[PDB]
Amino acid sequence: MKNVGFIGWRGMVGSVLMDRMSQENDFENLNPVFFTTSQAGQKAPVFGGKDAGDLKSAFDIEELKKLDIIVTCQGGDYTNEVYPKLKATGWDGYWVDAASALRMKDDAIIVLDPVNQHVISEGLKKGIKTFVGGNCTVSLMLMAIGGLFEKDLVEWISVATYQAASGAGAKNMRELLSQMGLLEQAVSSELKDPASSILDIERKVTAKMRADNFPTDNFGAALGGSLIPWIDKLLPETGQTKEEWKGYAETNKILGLSDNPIPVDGLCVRIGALRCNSQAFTIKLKKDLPLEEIEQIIASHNEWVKVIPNDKEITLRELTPAKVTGTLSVPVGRLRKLAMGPEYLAAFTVGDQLLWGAAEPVRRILKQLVA
Amino acid sequence: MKNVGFIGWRGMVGSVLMDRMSQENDFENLNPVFFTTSQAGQKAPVFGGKDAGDLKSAFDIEELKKLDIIVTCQGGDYTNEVYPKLKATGWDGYWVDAASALRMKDDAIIVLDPVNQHVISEGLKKGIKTFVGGNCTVSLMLMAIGGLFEKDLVEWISVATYQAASGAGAKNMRELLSQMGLLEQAVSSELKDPASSILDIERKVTAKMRADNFPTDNFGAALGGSLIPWIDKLLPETGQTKEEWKGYAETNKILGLSDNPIPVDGLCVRIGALRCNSQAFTIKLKKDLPLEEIEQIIASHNEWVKVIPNDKEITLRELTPAKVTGTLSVPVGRLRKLAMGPEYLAAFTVGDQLLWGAAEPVRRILKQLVA
Ligand SMILES: NC(=O)c1ccc[n+]([C@@H]2O[C@H](COP(=O)([O-])OP(=O)(O)OC[C@H]3O[C@@H](n4cnc5c(N)ncnc54)[C@H](OP(=O)(O)O)[C@@H]3O)[C@@H](O)[C@H]2O)c1
Ligand SMILES: NC(=O)c1ccc[n+]([C@@H]2O[C@H](COP(=O)([O-])OP(=O)(O)OC[C@H]3O[C@@H](n4cnc5c(N)ncnc54)[C@H](OP(=O)(O)O)[C@@H]3O)[C@@H](O)[C@H]2O)c1
Ligand SMILES: C[As](C)(=O)[O-]
Ligand SMILES: C[As](C)(=O)[O-]
Numbered sequence: 112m113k114n115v116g117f118i119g120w121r122g123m124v125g126s127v128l129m130d131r132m133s134q135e136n137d138f139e140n141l142n143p144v145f146f147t148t149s150q151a152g153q154k155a156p157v158f159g160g161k162d163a164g165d166l167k168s169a170f171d172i173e174e175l176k177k178l179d180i181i182v183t184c185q186g187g188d189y190t191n192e193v194y195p196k197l198k199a200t201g202w203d204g205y206w207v208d209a210a211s212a213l214r215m216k217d218d219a220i221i222v223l224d225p226v227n228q229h230v231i232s233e234g235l236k237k238g239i240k241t242f243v244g245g246n247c248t249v250s251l252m253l254m255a256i257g258g259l260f261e262k263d264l265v266e267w268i269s270v271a272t273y274q275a276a277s278g279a280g281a282k283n284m285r286e287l288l289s290q291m292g293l294l295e296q297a298v299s300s301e302l303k304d305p306a307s308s309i310l311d312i313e314r315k316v317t318a319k320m321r322a323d324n325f326p327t328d329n330f331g332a333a334l335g336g337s338l339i340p341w342i343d344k345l346l347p348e349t350g351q352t353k354e355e356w357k358g359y360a361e362t363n364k365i366l367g368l369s370d371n372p373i374p375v376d377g378l379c380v381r382i383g384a385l386r387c388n389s390q391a392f393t394i395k396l397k398k399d400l401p402l403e404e405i406e407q408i409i410a411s412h413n414e415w416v417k418v419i420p421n422d423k424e425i426t427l428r429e430l431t432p433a434k435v436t437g438t439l440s441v442p443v444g445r446l447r448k449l450a451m452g453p454e455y456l457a458a459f460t461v462g463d464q465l466l467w468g469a470a471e472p473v474r475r476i477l478k479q480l481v482a
Numbered sequence: 483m484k485n486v487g488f489i490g491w492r493g494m495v496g497s498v499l500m501d502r503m504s505q506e507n508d509f510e511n512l513n514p515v516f517f518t519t520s521q522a523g524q525k526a527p528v529f530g531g532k533d534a535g536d537l538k539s540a541f542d543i544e545e546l547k548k549l550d551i552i553v554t555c556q557g558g559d560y561t562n563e564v565y566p567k568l569k570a571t572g573w574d575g576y577w578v579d580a581a582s583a584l585r586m587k588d589d590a591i592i593v594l595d596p597v598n599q600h601v602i603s604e605g606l607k608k609g610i611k612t613f614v615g616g617n618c619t620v621s622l623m624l625m626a627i628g629g630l631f632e633k634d635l636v637e638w639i640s641v642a643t644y645q646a647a648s649g650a651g652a653k654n655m656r657e658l659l660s661q662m663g664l665l666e667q668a669v670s671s672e673l674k675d676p677a678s679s680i681l682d683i684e685r686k687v688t689a690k691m692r693a694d695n696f697p698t699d700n701f702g703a704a705l706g707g708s709l710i711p712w713i714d715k716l717l718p719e720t721g722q723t724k725e726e727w728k729g730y731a732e733t734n735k736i737l738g739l740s741d742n743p744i745p746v747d748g749l750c751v752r753i754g755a756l757r758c759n760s761q762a763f764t765i766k767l768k769k770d771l772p773l774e775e776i777e778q779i780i781a782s783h784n785e786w787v788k789v790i791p792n793d794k795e796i797t798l799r800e801l802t803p804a805k806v807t808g809t810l811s812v813p814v815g816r817l818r819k820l821a822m823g824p825e826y827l828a829a830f831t832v833g834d835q836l837l838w839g840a841a842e843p844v845r846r847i848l849k850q851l852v853a
Contacts, residue, residue, distance in 0.1 A: 123680050130681075267822045271642030271762035273709055273751065281680035285673055288666045288687065291706065292673075295663025302656055302663075309494050309652035310501075313756055316659065317807050331795075335662065336756055337804040338644055340816055340830045341797045350773075350792050350818030359821050376821035378762045378830050380644065383754040385684055385707050391642035391749045393764060395822075402721075421721050424702075426712045433708040436688050445711055447721025450730050450747040451638045451766075457721075459711045459749050 113481045114142045116178040118169045119185030120156070121147070123281045124209050128184055128470040133158055137474065140482030144178060146171075148185070172196055180205040182477055184470075187212035205480055208243045209473050214361065221245045221365045222476045225413040226253045226260075230367045231476070242476045245365055246357040247468030248272055248379065248388055253365065254467050255443040255460035258412035259394065259405075260366055260373070266454075269393040270358060270377030274342065275432065276334060277386035278464050283329045287383055290326060290335030293319060330381070339381040354379040386465055387432030392458040399453035406446060415467065419444030435461045439471065484852050487515040487549040489540045490556030491527065494652045495580050499555055499841040504529050508845065512852045515549060517542075519560065543567055551576040553848055555841070558583040576851050579614045580844050585732065592616040592736045593847045596784040597624045597631075601738045602847070613847045616736055617728040618839030619643055619750070619759050624736060625838050626814040626831040629783030630765065630776070631737060631744070637766040637825075641729060641748030645713060646803065647705065648757035649835050654700045655756055661697060661706030662754070664690055701752070710752040725750040758803030759835045764820060765827040776827060777817060786838070790815030806832050810842065 119125040132138060138159020145155045146169035155163035167174045169189065175181060175197055181204060183190060190212040197206075206213075213219045219241040220234040221227075231242070244250070252270070259265050276287040297319035301307040319325060320333045332339050343353035358375040366373075396405075410418045419429045419442045428434065430444045441462045449455035462468060490496040503509060509530025516526040517540035526534040538545045540560065546552060546568055552575065554561060561583040568577075577584070584590045590612035591605040592598075602613070615621070623641070630636050647658040668690040672678040690696060691704045703710055714724035729746040737744075767776075781789045790800045790813050799805065801815045812833045820826035833839060 126679075126681055269640055269764040269820070269822070269826075271764075273644070273753065277684070284680060284684065288669065288673055288683070291662035292666025292670070295659050295666070298659065299663070302659055308497070309648075309655060310497050312659070313648070313655065313807075316756060317804075320804050330798075332798040332802055333804040336754060337758075337802050338753065338755060338760060339798060340760070340762075340801055340832075341794055345792070345794055350816075352794075374821040374823075376826075376828070377764065378816055378828055380760075380762065380830070382644065382709065383707065384709060385687060387708075389709055389711070389751075391711075391751065391762075393640040393642075393748070421716065423712055423716055423723075427703040427710060430711055431703060431708050433688070433691050433704040437685070445721075445749055449640065450745040451640070455640075455747075457747070457749060459751070461711075 112140055112142045113179040114144060114177065115180045115182060115477070115481065116144045116146055116175060118146045118181065118183040118189065120145060122184055124465060124469045125184035127465045128474055129158055131470055131474050137478055148189070169193065172200060176200055176202050178204055180207065180477065180480055182207045182473065184209040184473070186210050203240065206241045207473055207477055207480070209469055211243070211246065213241055214243045214245070215364070216241065219243050221361060222472050223250050223253060223365055224472065224475050224479070225415065226257045227365050227367065230365070244469060244472045246361050247278060247464040248274065248354070248390065249357055249361045249365070250468050250472065251388055251441065251460065251462035251464065252390060253362065254413065254441045254462065255416050256392070256394070256409055256458065258408040259396070261412055262408055264396050264398060265373055266395040266397050267374040270375065271391045272377070272379045273382045273384065273389040274379060275384035275386050275388055275464060276381070278388060279329070279381070284385055286326050286329045287334050290333060291383070293325060294336050334381060335383050340378060342379045342381055351376070352379060384432045385436065386463060387435050387461055388464045388468060389432065389459065389461045393449060394456040394458060396454045396456055402447060405456060409443060415439050415441045417442045418446070421445055421447060430459060430461055432461055435463055437463060439466050441467060483511065483513050484550040485513045485515060485548065486551045486553060486848070486852065487517055487546060489517045489552065489554035489560065490580070491516060492518070493555060494648070495836060495840045496555035498836045499845055500527070500529050502841055502845050506845070508849060519556065540564065543571060547571050547573050549575055551578065551848065551851055553578045553844065555580040555844070557581050574611060577612045578844055578848055578851070579612070580840055582617065584612055585614045585616065586735065587612065590614050592732055593843050594621050594624055594736055595843065595846050595850070596786070597628045598736050598738065601736070615840060615843040616732045618649060618835040619645065619761060620728055620732040620736065621839050621843060622759055622812065622831065622833035622835070623761060624733065625784065625812045625833065626787055627763070627765070627780055627829065629779040629781070630767070632783055633779055635767045635769060635771070636744055637768050638745040639766070640764040641746065642762040643748070643750045644753045644755065644760040645750060646753070646755040646757050646759055646835060649759060650752065651700070657697055657700040658705050658754055658756070661704060664696065665707050705752060705754050707754070711749060713750040713752055723750060755803040756807065757834060757836055758807050758832055759839060760803060760830065760832040763829045765829060767825045767827055770824040773817065773819065780814060786810055786812045788813045789817065792816055792818060801830060801832055803832060806834055809834060810837055812838060
């Protein structure tokens with residue numbers, strides 16, 4: 112069986128990949144070899160009921176060179192380090208990555224098979240050996256409205272995101288939780304007392320949120336009870352942040368439309384959600400079609416997207432992070448025409464950023480590479 | 483000196499108004515009369531160092547009929563009951579309302595004087611006697627980009643909101659806070675153990691958020707750690723919620739363009755913030771102007787709007803609910819041209835929903851009416 116190496120299997124994304132792989136018995140048709148950046152020699156974990164020897168150093172090129180496929184969830188720093196060194200040896204195996212590091216490489220293909228399988232297979236024949244997961248937000252967007260691009264109905268998409276703390280890292284999720292606790296703690300008794308003044312409570316919660324002893328070390332500002340309309344670094348040439356820039360760059364590379372690119376732009380905002388990224392869309396369509404047809408085109412693209420009817424009770428129950436968290440479902444709703452015209456479509460979607468937005472496309476390309 | 487009655491002065495919006503009036507000495511040039519729907523006969527609040535006798539009944543038409551101006555923050559059900567009975571007596575004084583009830587009536591003007599003083603002035607001369615504050619998000623939007631409408635540069639605006647808990651009520655803010663506390667408490671110990679599993683932490687928080695005992699009666703769903711992409715009731719004829727519908731309806735009546743409406747549409751989403759409504763805009767301009775000119779036009783409209791440089795550090799410091807809560811500042815940043823073209827402009831704004839979104843416009847028209 113093909114020898115597959117796993118790097119970053121212990122991380123947050125890695126842990127999700129391991130769990131998903133165990134659920135689908137992905138360890139059956141492959142020989143697993145586990146690496147580490149801090150536990151070399153130690154006893155390798157037990158997945159798929161198998162027993163790898165001891166953890167090998169993720170930096171041992173000779174060891175890696177023996178592998179047919181490398182699946183990494185370690186991070187960009189690691190990849191930019193080892194990858195060039197491994198290729199420099201002549202190694203011709205496959206490199207499956209969850210980090211963005213190699214996404215825009217001329218010899219790398221961004222994978223999201225339920226959306227761009229043709230691009231993938233084509234790359235495979237062509238000799239492409241590097242496959243990278245796409246930006247979580249772009250991935251979730253395409254899993255929700257892929258049918259529209261599939262039908263070549265999209266002229267341009269305007270996006271406003273509602274991104275979870277989890278997308279920034281495990282330490283960021285923990286900071287959000289700490290902030291939420293401190294906010295309630297600041298007015299614990301006042302909340303219990305029905306006679307208390309709501310303005311008195313707000314004043315106290317706002318003061319705590321602005322206090323020096325309020326944990327903001329990771330976001331650079333309060334997230335719980337607030338929001339941050341800026342994610343990643345600035346791009347001086349356009350004014351977009353790197354997260355916003357990915358919409359255009361990655362959507363078109365995933366779909367293979369670099370020759371006739373579709374404008375995808377907007378604002379990415381971080382909010383107090385744990386691990387589900389939500390998005391509001393203003394989709395300018397190339398033609399005016401019945402809303403019911405639009406819905407079917409969307410719902411039939413893949414089996415994970417789930418159209419949520421534009422009803423209050425149903426929306427509150429199905430189109431929220433609280434509902435989607437930990438599932439492979441990609442609900443999209445609030446679908447209707449906008450006032451600008453019949454070609455303007457409104458849509459809101461929610462999706463788990465660690466599954467389709469991270470571990471799932473990786474787990475899937477791997478399965479396709481092996482048995 | 484004019485006789486002015488105050489209704490709903492005890493609630494959340496009413497309290498902020500009383501606060502602002504006390505700070506601005508708005509009671510000096512008027513004779514205050516306080517009413518109540520539940521505490522008639524009890525001592526009135528002594529704002530402005532002035533002392534009214536006892537609370538009068540807000541349902542006493544004979545007492546109301548004696549006033550020159552009635553200022554109410556009581557609510558739509560109150561107004562819909564009393565306004566008709568009072569006007570039926572032939573009463574011809576001024577009615578200033580914070581509730582949406584009379585907003586779309588032809589004998590009423592939606593007031594936001596920094597934006598439509600001309601409408602207010604024309605209406606007064608025409609005989610209009612009813613002034614109503616506009617929807618909070620619409621008001622906050624115009625305070626931010628009124629300069630573009632002032633120059634007739636706006637073709638249409640696509641909106642995505644991030645609305646706070648207080649926008650729905652004092653009960654809802656309290657529920658949000660209680661929810662936040664419960665979420666952290668579910669993993670209090672794990673959070674202080676730096677070696678604990680993040681996925682274990684998230685599964686526990688999510689489980690709590692999904693527990694029947696999780697307090698969700700006010701929102702009908704979890705808000706803390708999540709979001710609710712639905713505000714108000716559904717309008718079957720367009721697919722919009724009443725909240726979303728107001729963008730087109732109120733923006734245009736405020737601007738006096740109900741005859742030739744500028745399309746303003748989008749999605750209104752509730753998030754876990756206490757009292758600031760934020761909005762992401764995609765503005766289709768009529769002309770292709772340099773970014774710097776657009777900024778000058780936006781900044782020059784009024785003294786409260788504040789253009790925030792498209793810089794990360796400044797944005798995290800100035801463009802957030804944490805910074806603007808309790809202030810009259812209306813920051814607008816992330817200004818840049820979008821990928822769709824040089825006529826497409828992006829912008830993100832944040833504003834306190836209880837000030838410019840509620841009490842401030844009311845407070846201002848009252849001052850105009852009393853002198
Ligand atoms: N966060 C998201 O929502 C998201 C979404 C899509 C893609 N990604 C990307 O996926 C890659 C990995 O992200 P991540 O958030 O999974 O990184 P992470 O949680 O920090 O894990 C990465 C590595 O940190 C090391 N580590 C040190 N202490 C650890 C501990 N106590 N528990 C677990 N691991 C520990 C592990 O390496 P050793 O075992 O060798 O020590 C682990 O492989 C990044 O490139 C990221 O950008 C993230
Ligand atoms: N919340 C916002 O951010 C916002 C923004 C824009 C517009 N508005 C609108 O402004 C109007 C009032 O909203 P609101 O949020 O201020 O309503 P509220 O807080 O419920 O106050 C309304 C009334 O409820 C009664 N009440 C019962 N128990 C009370 C208590 N424990 N404390 C204070 N009052 C109590 C009071 O009437 P009595 O004293 O007669 O008993 C009070 O005047 C509504 O039409 C609302 O839609 C609200
Ligand atoms: C969240 As990314 C750095 O994998 O585009
Ligand atoms: C903020 As309203 C409910 O008076 O449109």
